[PDB]
């Protein structure tokens, strides 16, 4: 509604994989639309980065080999503020939806939060590449920021909760 | 704060999202003004559902929302041609999305169920979700009916 | 102990729903009449899987995917690099169906621990995930879109008008 600022291993890798697939669909949908060049580029960058998160959590078995970097988290952070600055200031709570593209991005937002829940469970039973966790944490808010920008740029207001 | 509660709020938000997509899609075709306004209301109620489960200290969801669903479930079940066999998820794109909403709703229900077992919750939420999956089943059928598409039945050919 | 069984049914149901959506988008375009028919039988067999966990599904359906996989694999240009989910909207949906098929797999696998069940459902789901992978590729090939590849350096080359 706003910006929030072992089997456990295979489950984390799996959900991140799933999350990556929904980002793919959002990429394919956003592609058929001009004016989202940076976003589509950013999205593709997320898929490679998420691909890395999987490896860091499962495949990789040496910290020296961890691929995901801290800069990827910072990048996500700067886009959130940038997309927020862009989008009109929101004084209301948001509901998932609006343009088709914004909807797919919100879906990716919730699946990202799901992937994060799964990673939090993995980190509780063993040591992981903590960068991954923070990356997923920032990632969902990025999709929130993105979806709002996608609606505005499409001329469609965000769906708001009014009760 | 507690996985079971957070897991339920998140699965409900996930559900709400897919509804957002189904609504975006449904809004592109005529003859679905009733379904459109409802999905929007459902999103608000789901918002309330989440909040009601997030509470750990009154509730927002009302028993009337559960009743409204049932009514619409009948109105739609009637409008649609009586079925005499098990139906498979699919048909038009809209109906396919509503069906997805149905399964995710079932998922959200399972999570709330597991939550309930560990602690007290606003039970109206567990009922709302239980009917919602049926509403989508009935909404998914109507959409195909309306679009003169037709529900995908379980026809051998394997 | 009993919750693991319902979770497996719902997940399979959820998986079947995304498949219907994939089919809805895929059938909309010509040249994929083969997949359109295949995905169908898949939903029927997946409908059986649920029942088998509450036996209609046979080992014959499992071998069906086998052939389809290699066929599409041969048909699609042999990949020489890691690919990411995506491409055409159809490949994207089929790729989604893939990750979800694997999610249903984990649920059934969990059902194993609590109590052994028809060891056929797993076999199918296990191959179904591979099927969608290949299916997604052949779809991107026939559309001349080309699967998304894991290549960071190729990103800077993307249009950045705004």
Swiss-Prot record, chain C:
Stored InterPro entries: CblAdoTrfase-like (IPR016030), CblAdoTrfase-like_sf (IPR036451), PduO-typ (IPR029499)
Protein name: Corrinoid adenosyltransferase
Keyword terms, alphabetized: ATP-binding, Cobalamin biosynthesis, Cytoplasm, Nucleotide-binding, Porphyrin biosynthesis, Transferase
Any single Gene Ontology cellular-component annotation: cytoplasm
Binding positions (ATP): 1, 102-107, 126
Keyword Lyase among UniProt keywords: no
Main location: cytoplasm
PANTHER family cross-referenced by the UniProt entry: CORRINOID ADENOSYLTRANSFERASE, CORRINOID ADENOSYLTRANSFERASE MMAB
Top-rank lineage group of the source organism: Bacteria
Enzyme Commission no: 2.5.1.17
Record text on subunit structure and interactions: Homotrimer.
GO terms of molecular function: ATP binding; corrinoid adenosyltransferase activity
GO biological process: cobalamin biosynthetic process; porphyrin-containing compound biosynthetic process
Compartments in which it is found: Cytoplasm
Entry similarity comment: Belongs to the Cob(I)alamin adenosyltransferase family.
Keyword Cell inner membrane: no
Listed pathway(s): Cofactor biosynthesis; adenosylcobalamin biosynthesis; adenosylcobalamin from cob(II)yrinate a,c-diamide: step 2/7
Short name of any one Pfam family annotated for the protein: Cob_adeno_trans
Catalytic activity: 2 cob(II)yrinate a,c diamide + reduced [electron-transfer flavoprotein] + 2 ATP = 2 adenosylcob(III)yrinate a,c-diamide + 2 triphosphate + oxidized [electron-transfer flavoprotein] + 3 H(+); 2 cob(II)alamin + reduced [electron-transfer flavoprotein] + 2 ATP = 2 adenosylcob(III)alamin + 2 triphosphate + oxidized [electron-transfer flavoprotein] + 3 H(+)
């Amino acid at each position: 509604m706003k910006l929030y600022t072992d089997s456990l291993r295979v489950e984390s890798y799996g959900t991140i994989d799933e999350l990556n697939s929904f980002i793919g669909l959002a990429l394919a949908e956003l592609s058929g639309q001009p004016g989202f060049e940076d976003l589509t580029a950013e999205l593709l960058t997320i898929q490679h980065e998420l691909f890395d998160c999987g490896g860091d959590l499962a495949i990789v078995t040496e910290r020296k080999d961890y691929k995901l970097t801290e800069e990827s988290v910072s990048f996500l952070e700067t886009r959130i503020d940038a997309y927020t600055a862009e989008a009109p200031e929101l004084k209301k709570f948001i509901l998932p939806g609006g343009s088709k593209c914004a909807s797919l991005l919100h879906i990716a937002r919730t699946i990202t939060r799901r992937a994060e829940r799964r990673v939090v469970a993995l980190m509780k039973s063993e040591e992981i590449h903590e960068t991954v966790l923070r990356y997923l944490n920032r990632l969902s808010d990025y999709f929130f920021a993105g979806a709002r920008v996608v609606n505005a740029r499409s001329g469609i207001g965000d769906v708001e909760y009014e009760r």
